[PDB]
Amino acid sequence: HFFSFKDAMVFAFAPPSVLELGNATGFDLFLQDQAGVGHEVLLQARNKFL
Amino acid sequence: GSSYVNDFIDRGRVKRVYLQGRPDARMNPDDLSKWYVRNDKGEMVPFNAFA
Amino acid sequence: AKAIRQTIANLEPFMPQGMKVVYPYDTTPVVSASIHEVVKTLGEAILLVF
């Protein structure tokens, strides 16, 4: 039904089994950069990975 | 004494800014007279007057 | 020492050009050689008694 709310990405999800662990479920990782390549390179890498 | 004013970022890391005289104006007691201190009316007073 | 070598192994592919990391001072191989020497002398003591 929330696709009838066309201006906002209204994304509803269920909590996990226990709530102490995380608010989402599945996996999680951070794309980071030790070389100091900036922020545009890192965001381009994030959207490339997506 | 190489004072510490504030910080500055560079290449993704906040580092610091120092402030000190030249490597050629503190090296011997003859070069402690190159530094001038401002008077209370815009004039300049050397360190030979009072030190 | 093992965790420090693992951290340098995770930080080594992001070196600049010609940037080698060497270990000039280290007091861990004397500990490893000492425990290996006493377990070796234990082994040959059991072998000589047999």
Side-chain angles (χ1 to χ4, degrees):
Chain A
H1 182 79
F2 290 159
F3 290 163
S4 177
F5 294 151
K6 303 179 291 293
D7 57 351
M9 282 184 177
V10 186
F11 178 77
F13 65 97
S17 300
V18 292
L19 198 144
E20 299 175 356
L21 268 65
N23 294 317
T25 183
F27 62 95
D28 194 1
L29 72 97
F30 292 183
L31 284 78
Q32 66 188 359
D33 49 354
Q34 278 71 236
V37 298
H39 185 270
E40 289 86 4
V41 179
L42 182 60
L43 193 144
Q44 187 178 3
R46 200 275 307 273
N47 203 358
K48 177 72 173 178
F49 181 79
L50 191 148
Chain B
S2 175
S3 180
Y4 169 70
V5 284
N6 53 5
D7 294 332
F8 83 107
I9 60 172
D10 49 348
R11 203 177 61 84
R13 180 177 172 88
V14 46
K15 296 193 286 290
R16 59 184 64 184
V17 182
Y18 277 155
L19 183 61
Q20 193 179 1
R22 290 173 66 90
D24 205 1
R26 63 178 184 270
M27 306 303 288
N28 51 6
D30 291 331
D31 288 333
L32 304 185
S33 171
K34 292 174 69 175
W35 289 94
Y36 289 5
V37 186
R38 189 189 295 169
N39 201 356
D40 58 352
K41 60 181 73 67
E43 294 177 353
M44 277 295 171
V45 180
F47 275 108
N48 287 322
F50 58 91
Chain C
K2 188 69 171 65
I4 289 167
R5 294 178 191 272
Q6 186 179 4
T7 302
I8 299 166
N10 292 120
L11 291 172
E12 61 88 21
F14 294 146
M15 293 292 114
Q17 186 63 255
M19 191 76 82
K20 279 176 91 286
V21 174
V22 299
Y23 299 96
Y25 175 72
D26 196 1
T27 63
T28 58
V30 60
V31 182
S32 71
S34 179
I35 55 95
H36 181 71
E37 187 68 30
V38 295
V39 71
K40 185 183 287 185
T41 54
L42 174 64
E44 57 246 10
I46 297 169
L47 183 63
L48 288 176
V49 171
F50 169 72

